[PDB]
Design a protein around this ligand. Structure first.
Ligand SMILES: COc1ccc(Cl)cc1NCC(=O)N[C@H]1CC[C@H](n2c(=O)[nH]c3ccccc32)CC1
Ligand SMILES: [Zn+2]
Length: 208
């Protein structure tokens, strides 16, 4: 009924395909390391596959609808997502009703193709006050989690200066803003994203 969390063996080509994609999409943010911490590699502690029947079905029904609307192209893309509700999301799925009106591009769910970008969001906007135990945004101790999800983009609307919209523009199914820089993929329907992989990891202090 609920969600089954499956561990992936590090020697499974599937584990390797996800960690490789997480480690390789690390980038410099002209941050100084403030939001997500100072690092240039993660210690991937665990990769779990999130299996939930109802979520898959809601997600596949919507993906069909979007195909119909976009010349049989649902445009599925694997994307990272970071935020403080990861546990809630893996059990009940993505939910736009918990989406923040004020967001740069509206009340949607945000995704990035760069792992170092979603890591900045693990403990809230800008990385809030860091980890709960150490009030440190660059904690090398506490374990963090992020999601690598299948995101049904359908036809993406390229917006390029803020517009706080509540739904994708007419005829589109997603929004891509290029903030200052990097890209933000936004959806306004929980069922357009499926949280495929749950990743437990730590940022690692720079070597010396
Ligand atoms: C709500 O506004 C935010 C608060 C903190 C961060 Cl770090 C990012 C955002 N907006 C971007 C974004 O993508 N936020 C998502 C985060 C998960 C949220 N979420 C969900 O999809 N299912 C949920 C179930 C319970 C609580 C939150 C949930 C919806 C909005
Ligand atoms: Zn900590």
């Amino acid at each position: 009924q609920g969600t089954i969390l499956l561990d992936l063996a590090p020697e499974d080509k599937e584990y390797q395909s996800v960690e490789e994609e997480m480690q390789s999409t690390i980038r410099e943010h002209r941050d100084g390391g403030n939001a997500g911490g100072i690092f240039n590699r993660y210690n991937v502690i665990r990769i779990q596959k999130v299996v939930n029947k109802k979520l898959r079905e809601r997600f596949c029904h919507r993906q069909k609808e979007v195909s119909e609307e976009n010349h049989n192209h649902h445009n599925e893309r694997m994307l990272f997502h970071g935020s403080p509700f990861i546990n809630a999301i893996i059990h009940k799925g993505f939910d736009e009703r918990h989406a923040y009106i004020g967001g740069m591009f509206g009340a949607g769910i945000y995704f990035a193709e760069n792992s170092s970008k979603s890591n900045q969001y693990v403990y809230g906007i800008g990385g809030g006050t860091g980890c709960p135990t150490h009030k440190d945004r660059s904690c090398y101790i506490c374990h963090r989690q992020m999601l690598f999800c299948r995101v049904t983009l359908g036809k993406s609307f390229l917006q390029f200066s803020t517009m706080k919209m509540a739904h994708a523009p007419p005829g589109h199914h997603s929004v891509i803003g290029r903030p200052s820089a990097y890209a933000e993929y936004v959806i306004y329907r929980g069922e357009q994203a499926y949280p495929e992989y749950l990743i437990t990891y730590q940022i690692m202090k720079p070597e010396h």
